[PDB]
Design a protein around this ligand. Sequence first.
Ligand SMILES: [Zn+2]
Ligand SMILES: [Zn+2]
Lengths: 373, 373
Amino acid sequence: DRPRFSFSIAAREGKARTGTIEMKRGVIRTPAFMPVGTAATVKALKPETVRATGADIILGNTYHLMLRPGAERIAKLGGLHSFMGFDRPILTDSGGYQVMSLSSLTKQSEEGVTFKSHDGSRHMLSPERSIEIQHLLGSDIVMAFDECTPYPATPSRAASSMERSMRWAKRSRDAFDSRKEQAENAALFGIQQGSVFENLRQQSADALAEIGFDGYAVGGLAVGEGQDEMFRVLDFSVPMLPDDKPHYLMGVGKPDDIVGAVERGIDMFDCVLPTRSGRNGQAFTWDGPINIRNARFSEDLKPLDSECHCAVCQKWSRAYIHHLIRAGEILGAMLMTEHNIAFYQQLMQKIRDSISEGRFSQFAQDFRARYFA
Amino acid sequence: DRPRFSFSIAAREGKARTGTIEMKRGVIRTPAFMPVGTAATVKALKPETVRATGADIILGNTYHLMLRPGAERIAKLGGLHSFMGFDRPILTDSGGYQVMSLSSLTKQSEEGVTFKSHDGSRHMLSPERSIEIQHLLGSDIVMAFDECTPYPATPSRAASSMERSMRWAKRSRDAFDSRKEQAENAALFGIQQGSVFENLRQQSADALAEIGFDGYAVGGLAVGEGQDEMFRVLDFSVPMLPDDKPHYLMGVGKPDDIVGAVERGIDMFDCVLPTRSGRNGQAFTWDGPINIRNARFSEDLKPLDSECHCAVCQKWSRAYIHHLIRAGEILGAMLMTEHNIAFYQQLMQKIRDSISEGRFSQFAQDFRARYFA
Ligand SMILES: [Zn+2]
Ligand SMILES: [Zn+2]
C-alpha cells in the first residue's frame, strides 16, 4: 500500500527533474499539470474525462467551496472526493488569494483576514481555519495559508508580507500536525514569498526549510511581472528550496512558461488557462494557440490539432467546434476543454519522456521553434 | 443490408403498438422518443452519450441550422451526421414552425413564407426549399412543410390552413420524389392538420393517404389545448391514419402525455422538455418530477431517481447536482440532461416491453398511480 507521501526523482537534466509522488490516493507523475476544479468541478468535464486526458491530480479552490456548498456540508456528505466523484489526489489552495481578489470589505491582521462573500455574508480565514477547511474537504495536498504579495512591491512591503507569511507558515504547520487524521494521511506544502528580491526569497526559503514541509511552492509570481522577470526570479529562487522535495509554481501557465519553468527546476503547475480560455474559444496546438471562433475555421475539416491523440481530435472538426462556440452551445465548451486539458497532459508527457531520455534541452528548443513559428 | 424504410408491428394491445422501423442508418424501436438536437447538438451531450441512454434516432431542427451554420455549408462539410458525429437516423422538421415562432417580419403566401432571421437577414421557405434543405442536411426522415394552425382556431381558419397544408403536402411529396438520392435513401412523413375538428381531421387524413407517405404525423396539438382536449382529438384522429405506417405526435411531451398518446396509437414523439427542463433543474423520477434546486436536496445523498439505471444515478448524488445547478456549472446541465434523456428512454422501454407482453394497460395504471402520488 502506498505511503502518505514519497517523492522520488528518477532522472535529471540540468535543473529539470522527472519522477513520481506516491500518495495514498494515487501516484502523481512529475513534472505534473493540475487541472483546476473551481467549485467542486473541473468546468465542463466529468471526472472520468479528466482522468482520460492523463491528469493524475486536480486542484480544488477552497474559497469558492467554503462559501458554496460550505466546508462543513461537504464533510457531512463524505468529503470532496466522494462529493464530486474524483478518487485521485486533490491539492487544495488555502483560500487566501481569492479572498483578496474576489471578496469585499476585507480586513487583514496578524490573526488572518475577515471578509464579505462576493452574498455579503461575513467570514474569517486564518491559518488555523484554512487548514481546518482543507481537512473538512479531505484534501490530499494542503497549502499553507499565506499572502500573495502584490506586484510591484517595495522591498519594505515585500519583506513585511513575507515575514507575516512565514509566521503563518509555522501556524499552518502546527495546525496540520495537531490533527492526527490529517497529519497521517495528507501532505502539507509551504510557500516561498519575497517578490522579486533575492535576499527575501532566500530568507523565506530558509524559514520554510527550518519549519519543514512535504513540498515547496514558489509563490508570488505570474502576478503581472512578465516571463523574463518570472524566469529571472526562478533562476535564483528554485535552487534555494530543498532539492529532494517537489517544487510547485502556482498559477502558471502558458505552455512556454511551463517549459521554461521545468528548465529551472519546477515539478508542479496549475492554471485555469486551458479550461477558461477553452470555453472562450482558444485551442492549444503544437503550432501555437488558435481562436476557433475566427471565420477562417468555418469550413476547416481538420481537427483542432493534427497530432493530438484526444477523443475530440479523433471525432470532430474545427468547423463543427467553431459552430458550437459561436452558437454558445455547451458541447462547444465541453469539447474545447477536453482537448485543451489533453493537450496540456501531452505536453507534460513529452517533458517527462524527454527528461527521462536526456533530450529535454532539445525538446524545449524544438517545442518553441514550432509553437512560435 | 437494411431497406430505405420498413415499419413492422410486432405486438398490439388495444390501439397501442410496438415494433420497429428499419432504415439504412439503423433500426428504430417503437414507440420511440427522439431527443431534440436544436443546432446540430443535443444540448450538453456528446452523441455517444445520447446513444448510451438508448436513443435510436434524434430530431434536428431545420430553422436554426438553415441560419447557422447554413444548409449548403453543412452539405459541403459532409452532411449533418458527419458534422455532429451522430451516425444513426435523424428526423428533420420542416422549419416552418420556428419561422413563425422565432423569426420576424414574416410574410405568408401560397408559395411559402418569407422571413427575417432572429441577424435580420432575409430568407424564404417554401415546400420545395424546405425539402431541399432537409436533403442538404442529409436527413433520414423528412417532414413535409406545413402550417401549425394556432389554437384556438375558428372552423373557417382551421379549414383554410389545413387545405393549404394539404396542397403543400403534395408539393413536398413531388419535391422529395424529384430528387433521386433523397427518394432512394430517406423517408417522407406527411402531417395531419385540422385543429380540434373531426371533419377537418378526416379530410386531412384522406388527402394525405391519397398522396401517400411513409409515416403520418398528428400536427397542431400540444399548442395550448390541454391534455384532456389533446386526448379527445387523438381518440378520433389517429384511427383516420393508415394503420400500417408510423404515427408521430409532434412536440409531445410530458411522461403522462406519452403514455396516454401510446394508448391512442402513437408510435413516435419528440420534445425539448427533458433537455431544456433538465438544464433548468427539473429531474424526472418514477415518483414525479423534482426541482433539484430546492433546498430540500442540499444534503440528499440519494441519486436523482432510486431505480434509474443511468450513469448519473450510479455515480452522483442529488446534493452534488443541486450544488452544480445552483452554481450555474456546465456539469450540472450535462448530468441533468443525461439523466432526463435516460429516464425518457427507460419509459419508452417499459412501454415497449409491456405492450409486447400484453400488460400495457396495467403498466399505464401503475405508472400514473406512482408518478402522481
Ligand atoms: Zn485534441
Ligand atoms: Zn438517472
